[PDB]
Design a protein around this nucleic acid. Structure first.
Ligand code: NA
Ligand code: NA
Lengths: 99, 90, 96, 97
DNA sequence: GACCGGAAGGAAGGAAGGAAGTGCG
DNA sequence: CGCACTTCCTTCCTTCCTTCCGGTC
């Protein structure tokens, strides 16, 4: 998170969301974990530039997001296009598991 | 694992498969001259014989973001291969 | 020898060996061609069999995809959750 | 050169002679090299050390333990792309206190 | 129906890293 | 024992689709 002091994708997003100077490509839509991609093409490019993977597009990025469904990090907001919600309870388990 | 674009240019070089696909100029502008037949071969080759143009076109409509090919705006079954896009992957 | 740690190929064969585990995974062919009827279950079982929580099919399948290069097993091109065990690789291993 | 051959040596042995470009060669005058056939490099390495089970996956692991030793680097993004750290091989042959 | 693209999911395989096991020295 | 790996996974992806649409053309 902001206490992750390689870069995971779910972190890369929170990094941008925190500084709302990057609101031109992505920002929040309701503070209850609900965020929305304003320029998915731009989001992918940055994540590409980061990983030295300039061919990286939403098409390939999207896949990586939808792997966080079984391992609960984030969720799909039904219908709402480009809308995903973070499972805070899920990341807490991942970051501090209780056997 | 052979890609889709590789499979297309397999049967465009050999014009003995002109019953399925052919050229409309050497400007990277080919023509899908038997969509139903075109769909069968990919499915048969991939062990996925349920493949139709509907699902196959989606695969070719993921080639827009990736500068590999595009559509001939309006014209039917007419897609333009990026010959400066294949050179990038050579 | 297979005394040190349980190998994944050995982990899967321990369940389909008999039944009662047929609900999540079982055989489909004499060659083998086993099929996972509930991969979500199989993942959890292997994830608790080795005491490794946060285990899914993706992480499991990746390990079974490394088995291609070694020639331990082969995948049935197209068929969903379909893999066939290769006698060649397992013969070379086993006790030696 | 400065000649149980170690792995980091085995690769540099091949890069010298331009006849081994088939499987591995240079890609820049900054110690950058690509494995043009990793499966081939593994086969030669499995024969050399006499470990015929050898692949790229296990070969690579050894090269990714070299990161901690500061022997070589991952050329980020580029496929099969690794680069030697000249600084962290002088430390091995001339460990200065 | 062609033709378009989001979204949910298989499937190959590179790359980073823990962890026990293997000789060799 | 200390080194230098080797063996075998987890882990997290990038990559190329297959499938299923709803929706415009
Ligand atoms: Na699932
Ligand atoms: Na690195």
């Amino acid at each position: 998170s902001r206490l992750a002091n390689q870069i995971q994708l779910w972190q890369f997003l929170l990094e941008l969301l925190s500084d709302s100077a990057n609101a031109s490509c992505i920002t929040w839509e309701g503070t209850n974990g609900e965020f929305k991609m304003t320029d998915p093409d731009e989001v992918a490019r940055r994540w590409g530039e980061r990983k030295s993977k300039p061919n990286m597009n939403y098409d390939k990025l999207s896949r990586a997001l939808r792997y966080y469904y079984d391992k609960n990090i984030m969720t799909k907001v039904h219908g709402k296009r480009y809308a995903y919600k973070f499972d805070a309870h899920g990341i807490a388990q991942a970051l501090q598991p209780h056997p």
